[PDB]
C-alpha cells in the first residue's frame, strides 16, 4: 500500500516525461487516465503513429476510447493478460499500474543489446547482464538483483563513471552515505546525460526497494549510454 506508492510515483513521473510533448500532465495516475485521452497521447508519441479518439462523455465513450489504446497494443502483438476495458476506465489501480508497466516493458525494455547474449534471455536478464558487465572491473561491487543491490547507489555511480570518468570520483562514493551517492548520481545523470530524475533518494535507501521502479530507471540509464 505505502509499499505500492513508490511504484505509483515512479510510473507517474515516467508517463509525464513522455507526455510533455503532448502538453498534458498527470497529477494522479489512478484518475487522470480513466478517460483514455492521456493514454492515447502516450502511444501517439512513443510511436509517432496517429490514433483516433471518441469525444463523448458517457461511460461508453471512455470505454470505447480506452479500447483503442489497448487494441494498438494488441495489434502490436503485446500480450495483455487480465486487463479489461471494465478494469481501467474506472481506475482499478493495480490493473492501471499493470498496464503502464507493460508499456514500459514494450517501449523501453525490448531492444536491450549486450555483448555475449544467449538468445533466450528475458529483457530483464539482459539489462541485468548489461549492469554486471559495466561494473565488471570495479572493486567490491556486485549487481545481483534489481532490489537490494542498488541500495547504496554505488552501482549507479559506476555505470556513469564507466561511460564518463570525467564526472565521478569513485573513491569518494565508497566512503560517503547511501543518500549522497544516490543524489549525486541522479543529478549527474540529469545535468549531463539528459535522463530524468525518476527516483528520489529517500525512496531507494530502504531494505527492499521497488524492483519495477529500479528496472525502469536503469532502462532510462541505458538509453543515454
Amino acid at each position: 500500500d505505502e509499499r505500492d506508492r513508490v511504484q505509483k510515483k515512479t510510473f507517474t513521473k515516467w508517463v509525464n516525461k513522455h507526455l510533455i510533448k503532448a502538453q498534458r500532465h498527470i497529477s494522479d495516475l489512478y484518475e487522470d487516465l480513466r478517460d483514455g485521452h492521456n493514454l492515447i497521447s502516450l502511444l501517439e508519441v512513443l510511436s509517432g503513429d496517429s490514433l483516433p479518439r471518441e469525444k463523448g462523455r458517457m461511460r461508453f465513450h471512455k470505454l470505447q476510447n480506452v479500447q483503442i489504446a489497448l487494441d494498438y497494443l494488441r495489434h502490436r502483438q503485446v500480450k495483455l493478460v487480465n486487463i479489461r476495458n471494465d478494469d481501467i476506465a474506472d481506475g482499478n489501480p493495480k490493473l492501471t499500474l499493470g498496464l503502464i508497466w507493460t508499456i514500459i516493458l514494450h517501449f523501453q525494455i525490448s531492444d536491450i543489446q549486450v555483448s555475449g547474449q544467449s538468445e533466450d534471455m528475458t529483457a530483464k536478464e539482459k539489462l541485468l547482464l548489461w549492469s554486471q558487465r559495466m561494473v565488471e572491473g570495479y572493486q567490491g561491487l556486485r549487481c545481483d538483483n534489481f532490489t537490494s543491490s542498488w541500495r547504496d547507489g554505488r552501482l549507479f555511480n559506476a555505470i556513469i563513471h564507466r561511460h564518463k570518468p570525467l564526472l565521478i570520483d569513485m573513491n569518494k562514493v565508497y566512503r560517503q552515505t547511501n543518500l549522497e551517492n544516490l543524489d549525486q548520481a541522479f543529478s549527474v545523470a540529469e545535468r549531463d546525460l539528459g535522463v530524468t530524475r525518476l527516483l528520489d533518494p529517500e525512496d531507494v535507501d530502504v531494505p527492499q526497494p521497488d524492483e519495477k521502479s529500479i528496472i525502469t530507471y536503469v532502462s532510462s540509464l541505458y538509453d543515454a549510454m
Binding site: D1, R84, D90, K94, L95
Partner: protein, 194 residues
Amino acid sequence: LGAPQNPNAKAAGSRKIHFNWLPPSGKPMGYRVKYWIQGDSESEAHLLDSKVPSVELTNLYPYCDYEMKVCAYGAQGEGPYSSLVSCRTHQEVPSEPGRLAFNVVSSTVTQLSWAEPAETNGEITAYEVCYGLVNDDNRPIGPMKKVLVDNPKNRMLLIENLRESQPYRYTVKARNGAGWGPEREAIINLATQP
C-alpha cells in the same frame, strides 16, 4: 405572445424533477419545454410538449445538473422563452464496485484491489470490505469481518493472517450521499491462486 416569468424548478425524486412556472397572457394553446444537461448544447436538448403549466421530467441522471426553459404556442405560435432555470437531481445508490482483483503475496497474505463503481450517482464518500471463511457452497462459516475503508481515494487493501488452502468470501460496497449500494463478491482460495 407574453413570456412566462417567475419559474421555479426542483427535484421530485432521484430520477425525476418538477418544472413549474406562472402562466403568461395572450394566446397559448399548448406549451413546449426545452431541457438539457448543464454543459451540453442548446439545440441538442430534449423537448417535451406540454398543455398544462407544469411537467414531470423523466430518465434524468441522478446527481446531474439540468437547465430548462419553456415557451408558449397557440393562435399565433411560439412566443418568448422564459427565464432559464437550473436544477440538480437527487443522489442515488451507487452500483456494484469494479472487478475484485487480487494480488497474491503469501499463502496467508493478499492484496485486494477494486475499481470505483460503474455509475457513481453522486460523490462516493466511503466503501466497505467484508471478508471471512466459507465452504464450497458459498455458505459462510462464522461472522464476516467488515472493515470500513477510511477514505474513498484508496482502493487498495492489504489482508494478512489467513488460513491457508481455505476459501474466502470478499465483498465490497459503495456509499454515496444517498447511502450504500449493491455488492461485488469474489470467492478466492490463495492455494489455487498464482
